[PDB]
Amino acid sequence: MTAQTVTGAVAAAQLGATLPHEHVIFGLPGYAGDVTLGPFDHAAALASCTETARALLARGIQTVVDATPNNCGRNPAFLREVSEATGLQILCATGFFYEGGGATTYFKFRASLGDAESEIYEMMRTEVTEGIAGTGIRAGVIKLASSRDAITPYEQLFFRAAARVQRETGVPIITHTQDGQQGPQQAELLTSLGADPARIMIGHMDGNTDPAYHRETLRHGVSIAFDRIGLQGMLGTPTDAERLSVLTTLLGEGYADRLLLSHDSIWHWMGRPPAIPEAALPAVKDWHPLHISDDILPDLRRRGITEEQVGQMTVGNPARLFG
Numbered sequence: 001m002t003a004q005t006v007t008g009a010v011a012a013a014q015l016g017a018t019l020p021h022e023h024v025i026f027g028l029p030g031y032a033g034d035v036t037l038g039p040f041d042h043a044a045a046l047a048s049c050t051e052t053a054r055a056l057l058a059r060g061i062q063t064v065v066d067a068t069p070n071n072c073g074r075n076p077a078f079l080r081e082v083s084e085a086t087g088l089q090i091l092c093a094t095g096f097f098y099e100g101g102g103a104t105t106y107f108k109f110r111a112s113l114g115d116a117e118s119e120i121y122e123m124m125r126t127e128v129t130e131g132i133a134g135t136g137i138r139a140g141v142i143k144l145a146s147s148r149d150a151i152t153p154y155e156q157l158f159f160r161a162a163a164r165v166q167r168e169t170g171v172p173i174i175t176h177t178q179d180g181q182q183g184p185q186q187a188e189l190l191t192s193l194g195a196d197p198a199r200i201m202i203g204h205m206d207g208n209t210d211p212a213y214h215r216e217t218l219r220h221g222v223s224i225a226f227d228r229i230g231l232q233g234m235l236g237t238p239t240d241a242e243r244l245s246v247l248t249t250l251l252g253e254g255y256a257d258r259l260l261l262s263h264d265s266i267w268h269w270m271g272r273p274p275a276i277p278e279a280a281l282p283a284v285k286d287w288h289p290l291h292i293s294d295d296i297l298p299d300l301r302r303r304g305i306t307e308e309q310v311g312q313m314t315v316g317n318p319a320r321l322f323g
């Protein structure tokens with residue numbers, strides 16, 4: 001095992017309770033073009049993010065997996081600052097985001113002129129085994145993403161590169177699914193390429209409310225994450241009540257060792273600060289990284305989920321997957 005964090009290798013048994021998909025900082029592609037009126041205040045970001053990390057530690061959370069793709073404001077050196085200041089363990093990612101998420105097209109262009117898969121493979125392999133941008137800070141997971149209606153031929157370059165790095169290094173893979181679709185397809189493709197199903201987490205599976213979809217995904221041996229908990233009724237995301245309805249069904253069916261829980265929260269936004277309109281405030285009220293600890297786990301316990309099941313989802317599963 002060992003997990004590769006931004007401060008170094010840590011044993012699987014030292015990961016503790018983990019949030020496996022969050023964003024310490026995050027910018028939607030294009031934020032860097034808005035630098036003049038949306039500059040990065042490093043001191044303010046560090047204060048805000050350290051405060052958040054201290055709050056998680058208070059709740060028994062010892063590790064966070066930052067899922068931020070390379071083109072979405074990823075900043076390993078900043079993650080390391082937050083980690084060294086607080087003791088919160090942080091894994092960072094290597095990967096690029098879905099083909100309708102912007103940026104792109106740099107590799108789209110390179111793919112049209114040459115062997116982009118091989119170049120993406122070398123990037124992922126270098127960032128996992130040696131480090132990111134000269135810093136010596138290594139990625140502890142590979143980030144993949146697909147579009148809603150298909151895993152596009154362009155997206156597949158990244159899936160094929162990631163599978164090879166996975167086979168060679170053991171590194172975990174976590175994913176983005178768009179609008180509650182393609183989970184079975186991701187699982188099929190990655191397993192078909194010989195990637196280790198005990199080291200794959202199919203993401204945003206809470207985006208779909210039909211348990212048959214989750215079950216099919218789960219036939220492939222992989223883990224699945226209800227990782228946007230708290231983001232409610234916003235652009236097709238279900239409510240947390242709908243999420244927990246599906247989760248308790250799956251727990252009742254013995255799936256606790258393959259379910260994981262997160263918020264997909266953003267602790268500090270790159271670019272201009274977010275301007276949330278009045279009618280959207282309910283959607284984001286509970287969308288912050290203390291919601292699972294304070295609201296969700298106690299609610300599951302009230303519903304009859306056992307301490308053993310909660311510990312499996314929040315501690316056991318991450319140790320196996322990331323550790």
Ligand SMILES: [Co+2]
Binds near residue numbers: 176204
């Ligand atoms: Co995502």
Ligand SMILES: [Co+2]
Binds near residue numbers: 021022023067264
């Ligand atoms: Co995310």
